[PDB]
Design a protein around this nucleic acid. Structure first.
Length: 49
DNA sequence: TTTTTTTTTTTTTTTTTTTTTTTTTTTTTTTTCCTTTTTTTTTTTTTTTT
């Protein structure tokens, strides 16, 4: 809202629920995505293959 | 002669510093240059001598 851009609430609440799903702060880095419980090929496709 | 009281020695954490490691928008089009090199060993050749 500083730049006057409007994004719908669902697309923001989905991200806010993705980060707070595990009970702590799951950042969107290589330290939060690669520390999840997903598959090996999914995690190696992003960073630190 | 036993109990408290001081000393000691680990014990686990804390905190700060240092080190390490990993990352850095998407697509497309043209040229240029290099894709060895000097060193050491081996083999052949040429000249000389008896």
């Amino acid at each position: 809202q500083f730049y006057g851009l409007y994004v719908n609430y669902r697309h923001l609440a989905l991200l806010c629920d993705v980060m707070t799903a595990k009970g702590h702060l799951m950042a969107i880095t290589r330290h939060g995505i690669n520390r999840q419980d997903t598959g090996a090929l999914m995690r190696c496709s992003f960073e630190e293959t």
